[PDB]
Amino acid sequence: TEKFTITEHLVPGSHIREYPGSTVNQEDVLKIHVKQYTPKREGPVPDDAITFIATHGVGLPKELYEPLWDELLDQASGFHIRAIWMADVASMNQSGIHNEDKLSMDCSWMDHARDLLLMINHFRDQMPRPLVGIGHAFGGNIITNLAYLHPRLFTTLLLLDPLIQLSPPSLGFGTDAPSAINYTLWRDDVWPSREVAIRANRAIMQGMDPRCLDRMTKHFFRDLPTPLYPDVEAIKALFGTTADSTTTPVTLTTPKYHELVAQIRQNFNARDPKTGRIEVPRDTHADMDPLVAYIPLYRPEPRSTFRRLETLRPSCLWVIAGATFLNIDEIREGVKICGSGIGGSGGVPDGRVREVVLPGFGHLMPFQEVKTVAETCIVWLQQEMDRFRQTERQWKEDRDGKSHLAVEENWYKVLKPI
């Protein structure tokens, strides 16, 4: 918004959710809240200007990414931005508010891939090639699954600390340390005032770019009443603030429960009570690897996504936070195999995949190190746009004066008659 016009949209998402308990009724129409960022521009839009399709991390409002968009435009070299499109996942942020009477206690990351495919088809007239995907965290997983759904859709992908790995998270089982997931279930989720909520959440905002701070305090917290906290006076009574009629309690805009059921999924029925043996229940958990069913929580998408990486068609930049809490070593094995097999870009051996590990940077680097994250993206984009322009030109040259109606002469040389 330093550099862009913002257009808001509310678009219907994918019919029939991957998990039946993700909505109140299985036919519910979830909507996604989209912001479209169009650069303020005197001249006409260049013909190869990029359409960016961006996805956020769990519980992170799309508006937090606006400084990154400003930096991408400010530092753009050898490419133009037609527009950046970022949607809130249906169960989170502004989308979750719009869908609040239809949401329920489940979440598949795959649904947002289908929601985005629908969005792109809805706005196709404003989204000519080239398209580029950007995904942060579970958004990195989602944008990769969109590339699996539609291999030639994206020219390239920009993954920012993507949740693509094999190993389950730490969940405090046995000797394991409780993780952000344990924290999410048990965390405070309501405060007597926005001022108290902001002070109580100093940790998540430490190191944030000042431009992100204002967006965080506005979007991360929501005034009561909400469906989870429908009674303002009952919460003032809980905090003993009833006498202050001027102040409104706030809650997490994305309920902690909607963060939680995106971070991890219940596996409460995997063990035969007689044999003690794991038997995957296919009615509810067909997508669960029996090897991860040993604990009563799982997350299928990081592992399924990792195992399909050799098929990833677009070129792919993996920007990894050196101080991430994700399994950095598994992520780097993902980089190595990415695009190397059938359907694939050609991967690291063809120079179609690169890792940049940013030492000392954390998971929230898109809000803490906006300029360096943008710079890393721009270097890759200028190389990929050079390759795009050359391969597009060579395509047109090779197609020049070929028929649209009948096959070329070589067919009659290779395929014998009867």
Within positions 193 to 212, which residues make up the interface with its own copies, using CB under 8 A? none
Question: What residues contact residue 128 under an 8 Å CB cut-off, 6+ apart?
Answer: 51, 82
Q: Give bridge partners of residue 72 from the DSSP assignment.
A: none
Q: Which of 23, 91, 104, 165 binds ligand MOA (CB under 6 A)?
A: 165
Residue 168 CB, shortest distance to ligand MOA, in Å, is 6
Q: Which of 299, 334, 366, 388 binds ligand MOA (CB under 6 A)?
A: 299
Residue 415 CB, shortest distance to ligand MOA, in Å, is 12
In angstroms, the CA 198 to CA 194 distance is 6
Q: Which of 23, 253, 263, 267 binds ligand MOA (CB under 6 A)?
A: 263
Q: Which does 153 bind (CB under 5 to 8 A by kind): its own copies, ligand MOA, none?
A: its own copies
Residue 163 CB, shortest distance to ligand MOA, in Å, is 5
Dihedral sign, CA of 201, 256, 181, 144? Answer: negative
In angstroms, the CA 207 to CA 226 distance is 30
Residue 211 or 308 having the CB closest to its own copies: 308
Give the number of other Cβ atoms within 10 Å of residue 17's Cβ: 24
DSSP 8-state secondary structure symbol assigned to residue 216: H
Residue 361 CB, shortest distance to ligand MOA, in Å, is 14
Structure tokens at 79: 């490419």
Q: How many CA atoms lie within 13 A of 26 on its CB side?
A: 4
Q: Which does 410 bind (CB under 5 to 8 A by kind): ligand MOA, its own copies, none?
A: its own copies
By CB under 6 A, is residue 249 in contact with ligand MOA?
no
Structure tokens at 153: 């859709």
Residue 80 or 150 having the CB closest to its own copies: 150
Find out whether 184 and 263 touch, Cβ atoms under 8 Å.
yes
Q: For ligand MOA, how many residues bind (rule: CB under 6 A)?
A: 19
Q: Is the peptide bond before 290 cis (omega within 30 degrees of 0)?
A: no
Q: Which does 124 bind (CB under 5 to 8 A by kind): its own copies, ligand MOA, none?
A: its own copies
| Closest alpha carbon to 35 in 79, 68, 78 | 68
Residue 44 CB, shortest distance to ligand MOA, in Å, is 37
Residues that bind ligand MOA (CB under 6 A): 57-58, 60, 137-138, 163, 165, 168-169, 179-181, 263-264, 299, 302, 325-327
